[PDB]
RNA sequence: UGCCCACCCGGUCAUAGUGAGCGGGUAACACCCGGACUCGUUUCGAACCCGGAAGUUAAGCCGCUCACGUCAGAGGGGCCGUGGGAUCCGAGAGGGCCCGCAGCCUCUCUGAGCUGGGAUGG
């Protein structure tokens, strides 16, 4: 299923915080194209953030046996 | 030779400045000698004007060193605009975004006199 790792920049009045409660998320998806939609899907409406100020910095794949979160883990 | 080294005549008008220290002169340049005549000091040969010319690199001049002033280069930091467009956001004030441009201050480091025309000196 190839779990993905997303870390990108979105802004209203400098909402950059490359850490984990006001800036970025995790994703489970097949490929980049499906994955890249999801961040648009959520951050686009959940906080009124246009894809203008969306700037994906790092996108990659994590291995299935090491993620700091168990909630994303057990759902398999 | 030579050319630069000063000088006279300059242009550039501080990157070329100011201040201090030091170095260079037997020519050049001044300092410096003396005033009867020229001229002249609301006193003075101070200065100017004339006649000079012993001494002398201490002045100045010149070069160099260091400071500051000052032009740039780079770095750090400070601060931040404006054209072009939308039934875009925001009630407004305002702001983002796509199309074009930037500059501003302040510290650090690095450079910092160029050049035309003629008579001396090497």
Curated annotation (Swiss-Prot):
Q: Which UniProt keywords apply?
A: Ribonucleoprotein, Ribosomal protein, RNA-binding, rRNA-binding
Q: Which GO terms describe its cellular component?
A: ribonucleoprotein complex; ribosome
Q: One GO molecular function term?
A: large ribosomal subunit rRNA binding
Which GO biological process annotations does it have? translation
Instruction: Give the similarity note.
Output: Belongs to the eukaryotic ribosomal protein eL20 family.
Q: What is said about its interaction partners and assembly?
A: Part of the 50S ribosomal subunit. Binds 23S rRNA.
Protein name as catalogued: Large ribosomal subunit protein eL20
Gene name of this polypeptide: rpl18a
């Amino acid at each position: 299923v190839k779990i993905f790792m997303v870390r990108g920049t979105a802004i209203f009045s400098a909402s950059r915080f490359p850490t984990s409660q006001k800036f970025t998320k995790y994703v489970r998806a097949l490929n980049e194209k499906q994955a890249i939609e999801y961040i648009y899907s959520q951050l686009g409406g959940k906080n009124k953030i246009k894809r203008y100020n969306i700037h994906i910095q790092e996108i990659k794949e994590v291995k299935e046996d090491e993620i700091t979160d168990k909630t994303i883990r057990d759902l398999a």
